[PDB]
Each structure stands twice: as structure tokens, then as C-alpha cells.
């Protein structure tokens, strides 16, 4: 799924995370763990053209905090 966190307001709302780059050949995104205990990989989705934007799949209750902690270090 693409949910980075769940919105608790109404209609089942979620924050989604997307990665944008000049490229369209991307297939996965890396998120180094803030502890240095390794890296998390999540697969991306078919990009959209407006640059190139790729939504993120592979977000689950086991890695949401680690990806957030990975972007917090950034």
C-alpha cells in the first residue's frame, strides 16, 4: 500500500509519499535507517508526467516509522 500514515479525519484519508526526479526509469527507492541498522527499499509505481513523479508502494506497519526516521535525518 501507499499509506505513509493514516489521516484520522474522514473518508479514510492517508498521507501518500512520492519521489520526484528527472527520470522515468526508476523502480525502487532507498531509505537508510537512522540507526544505521541498514536500509529499507520500497518499490515505486508507474510514474506520472505533468518532471517524473513516482508513488511509493511497500509502506506497512513495520517500516513506516523507519522511512519517516530516514527522511527526518535528511
Amino acid at each position, epitope marked *: 500500500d501507499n499509506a505513509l500514515a493514516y489521516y484520522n479525519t474522514t473518508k479514510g484519508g492517508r498521507f501518500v509519499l512520492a519521489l520526484l526526479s528527472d527520470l522515468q526509469d526508476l*523502480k*525502487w527507492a532507498r531509505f537508510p535507517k537512522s540507526d544505521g541498522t*541498514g*536500509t*529499507i*527499499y520500497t*518499490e515505486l509505481e508507474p510514474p506520472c508526467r505533468f518532471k517524473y513523479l513516482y508513488f511509493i508502494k*511497500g*509502506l506497512n506497519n513495520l517500516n513506516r516509522g523507519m522511512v519517516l526516521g530516514s527522511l527526518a535525518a535528511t
Partner: nanobody
Amino acid sequence: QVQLQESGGGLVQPGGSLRLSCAASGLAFSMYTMGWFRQAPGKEREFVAMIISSGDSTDYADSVKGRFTISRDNGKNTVYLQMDSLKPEDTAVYYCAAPKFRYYFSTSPGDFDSWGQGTQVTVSS
């Protein structure tokens, strides 16, 4: 309920090659990123390689880049690790790793609970 049978290991001479196999049983294989880990004697399991669900993108530890090649067959629910230009440093037990959820992987041995029995790879004289 998720089983991993690994094979392909053995004893070879430096510079030789090997091809490991892991057949996975009991999971919607084509929706998982799969990968391999290795564990020398004493040292802790380390990430080797990973390959996304669809089979057409990969990532390798730097110590095996250019020498190893990971691939998969979504038909047989098998992932492969082609090992070329083997070095003694490569000696270790190799493990096939399946994560607990779809479309994601981690290089942290602690984030896994589906571990095969391994296959021994010995590169020596």
C-alpha cells in the same frame, strides 16, 4: 507456512562460479521483493542482493557488484543468485530472504522471520 528451500552451494576454486537457487513455498511470490543474505563464520548475516517483485530491477552490496547477478522466476516461485569470479572472502552460508510484506525489502537481518536453512558456499584451494 512460508517455506524456503535453498540449493546450489558447494566448494569451488577462486575465480569459479556457482548458481544458488531458492524455491519459495506458500506466498504470493510475485508481489514480494526477494533477496539474499550471507553469513561468514562468526560474523553476522549481511545483505547480498535484492530484486523487486517484477524481476526487472536489482541492487547489490558493493562487495559483490559486477560479480553477482540476482534473478527470479515468478512462475516457479524461485529466485537465483549467479555467482561469478568467486573469492575466498565469499565463503559463507547463503540465505534466501522473504520479507513480511509486499513490495518492500530491508537489508537488516533483524527485519526478517522467513529464513531458509541456507546453503554452504566454500571458495578455497
